[PDB]
Amino acid sequence: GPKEWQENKSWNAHFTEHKSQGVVVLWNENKQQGFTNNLKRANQAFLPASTFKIPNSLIALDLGVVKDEHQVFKWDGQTRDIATWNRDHNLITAMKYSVVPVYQEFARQIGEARMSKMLHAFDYGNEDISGNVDSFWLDGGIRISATEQISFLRKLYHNKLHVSERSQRIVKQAMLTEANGDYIIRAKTGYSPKIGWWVGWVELDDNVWFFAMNMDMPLGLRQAITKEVLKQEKIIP
Amino acid sequence: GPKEWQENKSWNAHFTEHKSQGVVVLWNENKQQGFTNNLKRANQAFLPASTFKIPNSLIALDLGVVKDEHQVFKWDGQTRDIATWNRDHNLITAMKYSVVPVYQEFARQIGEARMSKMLHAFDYGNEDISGNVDSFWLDGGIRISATEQISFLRKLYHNKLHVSERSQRIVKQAMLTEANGDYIIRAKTGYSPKIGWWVGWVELDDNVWFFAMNMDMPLGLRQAITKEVLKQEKIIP
Ligand SMILES: [Cl-]
């Protein structure tokens, strides 16, 4: 009978087209079935990089480190290389522009004990915050696979994570990336030197498709390759 | 001192382009200043038509008539003129396709006493539900102006309406109409033979512009005219 996970290697063409190497993982929520071009890489655990802003946001909200999505976190006045980082931000814009220093301050206020407890409660990756509490998702020991990202995102979608419903609704709002009359994408990018990510889901009228992709050494290719797979599968026009 | 409200009649060109007549009202949240092509019409009261799905959704959720945005309201099997109505819906798709019969069922469950009490607590228009409990926003006594729509929407945006924060967040999610890297639109269309509406807001990185437009005897002109004003004011590209 049918399998929970099927391999579709025709998606490799979308990586080959860009001389890229990576994995796309899709989960059809109605059918309760997943699809990927590479089942091995789909289960390979990598640094989450800025995809960690999803659980980090949830924890900061649930503990009151972030009061709501409108609270302003003032620029500390240090000029950094990414220009959009050198300004005041709220939760919405800090996630949109992947503003690392804003989330590093969240993480310090959360603190290591609560961060580790919350990641265990979330069943998140290898749950390992070794390193600095304000950088482990960038250069420490935490590792999460694409299928583990799907599992985490499905819990978030269904408000099943062990944080308040309010925290989950606000983070799903902050994840909003694109919407029109055909679909809604809620997602988060991530970039580290060796790995780039895009994880999230596509809401349709009568189904949800969760996705998690990563690729070696990326940036716009993360969304472009993912969208080529979504188009091939007729999920988006 | 500066004016809270200013009239810009140059926007009339976007109406007369289509041999149309109406009002657009804009509110700049950061500046606390409003702009309109027609100050008198901005404050005249009209039937809300399907813009009433915003307060109706809020009330149905707060009273538990609708449990959440996933609850399915099955098609009653009656083939109606609008094809997208002849199917099962949840709150998200019922608002997207303006599915009148789903919301009439909400209104019947809410009932006259609780509907009137809620609209009073919302300060919603003339607070008058005279007419049929399940059609007064289409052919009964309720009236609201464009500036009153703005004031109601600002309360919703800030979670200041009387109902639970949860109900307000769910309805703001259901109002999602369009999103990209430049802006987010949360809005609701309204149509009756007499009046057409588009009300909502545009979220930018560091500001939000509320809008309410109505126009005589309409359909796509509602959004098209509003966007021509937003483009003229450099709110959207
Ligand atoms: Cl949203």
Residue numbers in the entry:
A (entry chain A), B (entry chain B): 21 to 238, 243 to 261
Text of the article:
Nacubactam is distinguished from avibactam by an extended C2 substituent bearing a 1-aminoethoxy group. Both OXA-163 and OXA-405 have four amino acid deletions within the β5–β6 loop, including of residue Arg214. Crystal structures were obtained for OXA-163 and OXA-405, as uncomplexed enzymes and in the nacubactam- and avibactam-bound forms. Both OXA-163 and OXA-405 assemble as homodimers in the asymmetric unit. Consistent with their high overall sequence identities, they adopt very similar overall folds and active site arrangements compared to OXA-48. The exception is the Ser70 nucleophile, which is in dual conformations in one of the two chains in the crystallographic dimers of uncomplexed OXA-163 and OXA-405. The respective protein backbones only differ at the β5–β6 loop, which is truncated in the cases of OXA-163 and OXA-405, compared to OXA-48. Part of the OXA-405 β7–α10 loop, which neighbours the β5–β6 loop, could not be modelled due to weak electron density, indicating that this loop is more mobile in uncomplexed OXA-405, compared to the other enzymes. β7–α10 loop flexibility coincides with the presence of an alternative side chain rotamer for Tyr211 in the OXA-405:nacubactam complex.
The OXA-48 carbapenemase is widely disseminated in Enterobacterales, necessitating new treatments for producer strains. OXA-48 is a class D SBL that uses a nucleophilic serine (Ser70) to hydrolyse β-lactams, with a proximal post-translationally carbamylated lysine (Lys73) proposed to act as the general base for both the acylation and deacylation steps of the reaction. Diazabicyclooctane (DBO) inhibitors, including avibactam and nacubactam, act on a wide range of enzymes to overcome β-lactamase-mediated resistance. Here we describe investigations on how avibactam and nacubactam inhibit OXA-48 and two variants, OXA-163 and OXA-405, with deletions in the β5–β6 loop neighbouring the active site that modify activity towards different β-lactam classes.
